[PDB]
Coordinates of C-alpha atoms and ligand atoms in Angstrom, one line a residue:
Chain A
X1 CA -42.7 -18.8 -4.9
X2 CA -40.6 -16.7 -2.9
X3 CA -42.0 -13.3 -3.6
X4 CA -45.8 -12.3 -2.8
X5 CA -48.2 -13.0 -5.3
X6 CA -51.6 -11.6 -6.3
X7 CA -53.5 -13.1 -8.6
X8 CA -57.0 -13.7 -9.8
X9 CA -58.9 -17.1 -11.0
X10 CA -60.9 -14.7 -13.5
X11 CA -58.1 -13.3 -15.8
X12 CA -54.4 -13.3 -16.0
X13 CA -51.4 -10.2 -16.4
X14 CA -52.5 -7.8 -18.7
X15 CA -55.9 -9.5 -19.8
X16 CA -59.5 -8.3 -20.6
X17 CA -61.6 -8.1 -17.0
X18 CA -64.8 -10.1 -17.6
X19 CA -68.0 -8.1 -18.1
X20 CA -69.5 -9.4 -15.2
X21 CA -66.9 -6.9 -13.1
X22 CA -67.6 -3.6 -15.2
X23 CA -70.6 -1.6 -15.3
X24 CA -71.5 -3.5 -18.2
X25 CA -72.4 -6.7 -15.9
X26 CA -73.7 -6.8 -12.1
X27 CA -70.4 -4.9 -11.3
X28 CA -69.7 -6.5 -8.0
X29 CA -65.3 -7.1 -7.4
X30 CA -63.3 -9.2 -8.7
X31 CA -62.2 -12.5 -7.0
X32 CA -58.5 -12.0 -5.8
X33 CA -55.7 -13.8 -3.9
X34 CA -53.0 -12.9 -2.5
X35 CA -50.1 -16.4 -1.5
X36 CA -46.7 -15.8 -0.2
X37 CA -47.1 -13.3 1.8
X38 CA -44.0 -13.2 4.4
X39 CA -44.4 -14.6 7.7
X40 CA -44.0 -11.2 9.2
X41 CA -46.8 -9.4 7.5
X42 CA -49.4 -8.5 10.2
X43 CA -52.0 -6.8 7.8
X44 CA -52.5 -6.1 4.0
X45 CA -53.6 -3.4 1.8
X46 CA -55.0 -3.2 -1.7
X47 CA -55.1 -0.3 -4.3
X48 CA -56.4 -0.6 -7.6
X49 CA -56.4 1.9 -9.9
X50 CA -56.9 3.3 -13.2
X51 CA -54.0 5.4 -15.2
X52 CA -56.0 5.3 -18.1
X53 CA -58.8 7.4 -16.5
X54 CA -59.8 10.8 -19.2
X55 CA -57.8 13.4 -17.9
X56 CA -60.3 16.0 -19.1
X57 CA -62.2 14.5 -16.1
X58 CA -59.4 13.8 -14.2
X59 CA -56.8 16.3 -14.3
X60 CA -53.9 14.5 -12.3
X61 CA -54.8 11.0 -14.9
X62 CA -55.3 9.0 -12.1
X63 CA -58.3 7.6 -10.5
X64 CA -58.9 4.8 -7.5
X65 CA -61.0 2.5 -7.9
X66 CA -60.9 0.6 -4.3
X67 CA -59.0 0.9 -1.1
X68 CA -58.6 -2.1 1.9
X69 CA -56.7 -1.9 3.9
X70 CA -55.6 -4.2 7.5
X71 CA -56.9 -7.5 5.7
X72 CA -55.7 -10.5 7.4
X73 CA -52.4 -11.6 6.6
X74 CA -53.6 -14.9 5.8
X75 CA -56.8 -13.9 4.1
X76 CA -56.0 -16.0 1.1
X77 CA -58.8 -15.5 -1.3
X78 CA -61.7 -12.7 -1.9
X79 CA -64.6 -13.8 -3.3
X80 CA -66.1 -12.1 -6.2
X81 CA -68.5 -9.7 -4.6
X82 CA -67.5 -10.9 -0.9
X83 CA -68.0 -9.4 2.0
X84 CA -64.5 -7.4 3.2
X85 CA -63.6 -8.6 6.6
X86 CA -61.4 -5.3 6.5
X87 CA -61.6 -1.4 6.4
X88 CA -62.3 -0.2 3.0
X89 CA -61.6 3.2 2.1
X90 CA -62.8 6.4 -0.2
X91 CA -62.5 5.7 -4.0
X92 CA -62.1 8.9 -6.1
X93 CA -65.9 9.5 -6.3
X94 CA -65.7 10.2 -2.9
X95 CA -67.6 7.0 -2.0
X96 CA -66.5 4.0 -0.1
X97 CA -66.1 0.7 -1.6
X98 CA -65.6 -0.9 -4.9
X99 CA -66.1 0.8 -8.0
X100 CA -66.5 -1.2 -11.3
X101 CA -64.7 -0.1 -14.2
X102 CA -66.8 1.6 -16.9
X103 CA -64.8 3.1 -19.1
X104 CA -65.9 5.8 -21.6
X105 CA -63.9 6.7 -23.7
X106 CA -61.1 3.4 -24.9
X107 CA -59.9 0.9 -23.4
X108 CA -58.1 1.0 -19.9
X109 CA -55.7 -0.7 -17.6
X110 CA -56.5 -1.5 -13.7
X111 CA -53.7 -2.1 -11.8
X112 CA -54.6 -4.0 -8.9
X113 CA -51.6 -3.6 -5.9
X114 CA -51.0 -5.6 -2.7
X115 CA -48.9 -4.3 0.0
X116 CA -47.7 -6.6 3.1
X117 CA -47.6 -4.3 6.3
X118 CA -45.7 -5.3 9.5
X119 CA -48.3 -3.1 11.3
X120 CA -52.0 -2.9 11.8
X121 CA -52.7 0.3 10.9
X122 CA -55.1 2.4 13.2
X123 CA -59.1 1.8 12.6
X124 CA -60.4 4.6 10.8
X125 CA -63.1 5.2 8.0
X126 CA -63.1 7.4 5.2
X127 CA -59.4 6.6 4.4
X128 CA -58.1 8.1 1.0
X129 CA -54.9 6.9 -0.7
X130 CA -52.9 9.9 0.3
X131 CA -54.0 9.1 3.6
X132 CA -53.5 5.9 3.7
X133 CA -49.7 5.8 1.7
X134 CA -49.2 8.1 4.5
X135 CA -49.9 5.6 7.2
X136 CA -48.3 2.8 5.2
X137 CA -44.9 4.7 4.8
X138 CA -41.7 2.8 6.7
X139 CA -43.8 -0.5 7.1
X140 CA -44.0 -1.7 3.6
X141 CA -42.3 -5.1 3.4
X142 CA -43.3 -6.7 0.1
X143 CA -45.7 -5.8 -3.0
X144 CA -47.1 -7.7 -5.6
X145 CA -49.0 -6.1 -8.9
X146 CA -51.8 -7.3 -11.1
X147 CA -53.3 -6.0 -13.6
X148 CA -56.1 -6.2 -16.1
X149 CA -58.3 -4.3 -18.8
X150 CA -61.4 -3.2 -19.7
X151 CA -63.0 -2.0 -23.0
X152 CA -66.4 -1.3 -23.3
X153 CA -68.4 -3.8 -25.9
Chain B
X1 CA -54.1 -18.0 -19.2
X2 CA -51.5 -18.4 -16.4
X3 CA -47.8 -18.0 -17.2
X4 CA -46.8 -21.5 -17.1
X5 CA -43.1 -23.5 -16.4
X6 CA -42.9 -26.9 -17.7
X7 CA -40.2 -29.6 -19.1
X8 CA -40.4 -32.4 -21.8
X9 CA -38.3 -34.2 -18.8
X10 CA -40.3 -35.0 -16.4
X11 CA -44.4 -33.5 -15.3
X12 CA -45.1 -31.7 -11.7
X13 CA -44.3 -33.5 -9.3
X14 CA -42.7 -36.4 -11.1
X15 CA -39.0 -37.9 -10.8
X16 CA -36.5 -35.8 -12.3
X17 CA -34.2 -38.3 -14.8
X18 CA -31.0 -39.5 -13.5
X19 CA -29.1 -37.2 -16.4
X20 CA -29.7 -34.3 -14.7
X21 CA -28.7 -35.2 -11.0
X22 CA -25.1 -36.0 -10.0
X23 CA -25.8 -39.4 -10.2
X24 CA -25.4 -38.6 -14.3
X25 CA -24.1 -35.9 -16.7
X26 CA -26.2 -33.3 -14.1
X27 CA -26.9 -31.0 -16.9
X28 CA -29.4 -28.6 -16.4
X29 CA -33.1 -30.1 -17.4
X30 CA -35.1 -28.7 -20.7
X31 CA -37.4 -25.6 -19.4
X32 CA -40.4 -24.5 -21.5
X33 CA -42.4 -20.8 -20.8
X34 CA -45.8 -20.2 -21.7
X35 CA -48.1 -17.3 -21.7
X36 CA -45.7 -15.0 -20.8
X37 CA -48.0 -11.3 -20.2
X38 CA -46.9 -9.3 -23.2
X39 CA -45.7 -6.4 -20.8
X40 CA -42.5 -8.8 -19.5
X41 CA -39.0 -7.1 -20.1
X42 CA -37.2 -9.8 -19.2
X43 CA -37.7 -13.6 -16.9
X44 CA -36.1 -15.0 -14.0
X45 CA -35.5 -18.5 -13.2
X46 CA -35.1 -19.7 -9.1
X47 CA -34.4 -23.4 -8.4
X48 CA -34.6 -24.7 -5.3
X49 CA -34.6 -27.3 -2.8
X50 CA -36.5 -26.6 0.4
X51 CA -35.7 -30.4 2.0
X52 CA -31.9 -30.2 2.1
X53 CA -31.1 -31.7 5.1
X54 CA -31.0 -29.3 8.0
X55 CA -28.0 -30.6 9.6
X56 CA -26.0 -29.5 5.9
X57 CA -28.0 -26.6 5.7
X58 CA -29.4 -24.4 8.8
X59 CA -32.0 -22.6 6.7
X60 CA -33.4 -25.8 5.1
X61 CA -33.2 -24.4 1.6
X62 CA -30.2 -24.7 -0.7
X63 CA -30.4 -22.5 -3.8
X64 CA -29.4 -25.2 -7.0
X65 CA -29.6 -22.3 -10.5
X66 CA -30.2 -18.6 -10.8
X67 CA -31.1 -17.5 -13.9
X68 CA -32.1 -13.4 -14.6
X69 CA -31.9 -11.5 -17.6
X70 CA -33.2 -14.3 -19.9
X71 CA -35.0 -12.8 -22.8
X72 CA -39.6 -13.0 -22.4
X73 CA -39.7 -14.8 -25.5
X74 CA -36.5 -17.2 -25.1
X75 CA -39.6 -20.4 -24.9
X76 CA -37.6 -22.9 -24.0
X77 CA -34.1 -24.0 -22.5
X78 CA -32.6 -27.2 -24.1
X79 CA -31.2 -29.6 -21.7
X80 CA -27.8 -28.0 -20.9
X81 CA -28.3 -25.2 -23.0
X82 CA -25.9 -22.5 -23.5
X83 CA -27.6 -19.4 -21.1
X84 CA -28.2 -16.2 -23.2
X85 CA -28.8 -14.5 -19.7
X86 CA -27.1 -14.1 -16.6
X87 CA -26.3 -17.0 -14.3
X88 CA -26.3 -16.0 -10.4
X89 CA -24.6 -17.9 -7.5
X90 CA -25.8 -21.1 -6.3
X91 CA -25.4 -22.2 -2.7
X92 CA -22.3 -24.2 -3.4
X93 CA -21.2 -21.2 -4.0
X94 CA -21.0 -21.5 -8.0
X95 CA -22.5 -19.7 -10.5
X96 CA -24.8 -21.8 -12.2
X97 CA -26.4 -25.0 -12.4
X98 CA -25.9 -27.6 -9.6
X99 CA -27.7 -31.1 -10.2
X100 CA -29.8 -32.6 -7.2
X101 CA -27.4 -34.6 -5.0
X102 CA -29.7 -35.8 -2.3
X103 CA -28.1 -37.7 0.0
X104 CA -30.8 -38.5 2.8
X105 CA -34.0 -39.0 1.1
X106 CA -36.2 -37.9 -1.9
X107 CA -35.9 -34.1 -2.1
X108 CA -38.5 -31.9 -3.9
X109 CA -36.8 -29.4 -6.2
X110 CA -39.2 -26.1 -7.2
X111 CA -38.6 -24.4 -10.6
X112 CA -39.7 -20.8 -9.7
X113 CA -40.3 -18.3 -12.6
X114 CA -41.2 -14.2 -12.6
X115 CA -41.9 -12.2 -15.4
X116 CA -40.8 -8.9 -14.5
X117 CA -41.7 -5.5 -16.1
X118 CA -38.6 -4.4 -16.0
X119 CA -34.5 -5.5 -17.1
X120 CA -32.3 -5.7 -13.9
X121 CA -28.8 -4.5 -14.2
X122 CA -26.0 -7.0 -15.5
X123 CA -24.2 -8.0 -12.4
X124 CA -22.1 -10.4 -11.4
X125 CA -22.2 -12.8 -8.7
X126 CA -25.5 -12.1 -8.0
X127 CA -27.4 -14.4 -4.6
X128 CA -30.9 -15.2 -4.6
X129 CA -31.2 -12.3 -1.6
X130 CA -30.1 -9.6 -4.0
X131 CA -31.9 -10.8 -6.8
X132 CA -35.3 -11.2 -4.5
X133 CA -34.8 -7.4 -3.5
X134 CA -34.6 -5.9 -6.7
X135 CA -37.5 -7.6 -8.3
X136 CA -39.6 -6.7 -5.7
X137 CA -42.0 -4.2 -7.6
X138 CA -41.5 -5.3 -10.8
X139 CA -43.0 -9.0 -11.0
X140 CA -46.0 -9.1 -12.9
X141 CA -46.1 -12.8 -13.0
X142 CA -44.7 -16.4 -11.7
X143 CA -45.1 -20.1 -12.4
X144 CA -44.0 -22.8 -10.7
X145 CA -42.7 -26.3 -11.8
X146 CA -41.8 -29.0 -9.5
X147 CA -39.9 -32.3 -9.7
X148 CA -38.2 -34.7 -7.2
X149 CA -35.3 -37.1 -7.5
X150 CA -34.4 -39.6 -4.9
X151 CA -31.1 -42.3 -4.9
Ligands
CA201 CA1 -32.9 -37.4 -25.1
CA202 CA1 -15.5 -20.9 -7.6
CA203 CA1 -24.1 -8.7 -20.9
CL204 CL1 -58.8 -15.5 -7.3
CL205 CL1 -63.5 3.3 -15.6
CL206 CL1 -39.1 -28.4 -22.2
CL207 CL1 -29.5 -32.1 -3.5

């Protein structure tokens, strides 16, 4: 196509997240890929989060889920559960890494975002998404958006 | 359950009939959408052909129907249809359709479409560039359909 994609083989816009990626299942991440990206990307990131998070628990609604960030332009796919040739950075438990989605309370939206840098951005751990918009900000070339659910069964 | 882009005309990757090429009618080829995420606003429509000969065409892609605006439940397009939707420039310079012509070999035409989240603004002479630029943020799906026609 002529716009970056990201997509995954195990569900499609707006769909149910299989179990398997939740707490309810082994809770490893979900297999991802990203096509199209333009020539001039040197690096990638990925955000996903969760709007739908209770905001008695999370005041500003909001709460991440799993940064990367200077994947390979060409990575093509991530295996579910693969190992992240990439940095990864803080979710909002403070932890790094992948976080499944386990939510309480109904059922909620992850929205899953690519970003095609024309920069690698400087080698550092412990990243958070302030942070790391921070570093992003005047190298953004393309995005792309998925997104799935999760409710509890 | 992929958004999908297909035509009673002709499958991926399959001749394109004569009728909707210059060497007929050239009326734009039937279109059907499928599982189209619930969240789309509105769907766009990019047809292209990427083997244009060079020599005509520096780039080596000349732009043959854009289509924004169209309604995410329109379903289908009948051959020719009457557009409910905005029709963009093409790279003859035209606003709508224009029917493969190739004149060197068998081209490869791609039938790109985007859900987007959002409805763009009702413009006028609209190019692929501008088009590209606004949905960037805003698709939340594609599809792709392919066909080729040779003389
Ligand atoms: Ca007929
Ligand atoms: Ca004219
Ligand atoms: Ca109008
Ligand atoms: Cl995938
Ligand atoms: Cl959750
Ligand atoms: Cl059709
Ligand atoms: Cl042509």
């Amino acid at each position: 196509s002529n716009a970056m994609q990201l997509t995954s083989q195990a569900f499609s816009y707006g769909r149910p997240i299989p179990k398997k990626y939740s707490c309810q299942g082994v809770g490893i991440s979900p297999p991802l890929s990203f096509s199209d990206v333009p020539r001039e990307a040197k690096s990638l990131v990925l955000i996903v989060e969760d709007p739908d998070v209770p905001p008695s628990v999370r005041e500003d609604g909001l709460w991440i889920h799993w940064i990367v960030y200077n994947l390979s332009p060409v990575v093509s796919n991530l295996a579910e559960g693969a190992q992240i040739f990439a940095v990864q950075g803080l979710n909002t438990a403070g932890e790094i890494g992948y976080c499944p989605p386990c939510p309480p309370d109904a059922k909620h939206r992850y929205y899953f975002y690519a970003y095609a840098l024309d920069v690698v951005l400087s080698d550092e751990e412990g990243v958070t998404k302030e942070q790391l918009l921070e570093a992003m900000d005047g190298h953004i070339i393309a995005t792309a958006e998925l997104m799935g659910t999760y409710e509890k069964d």
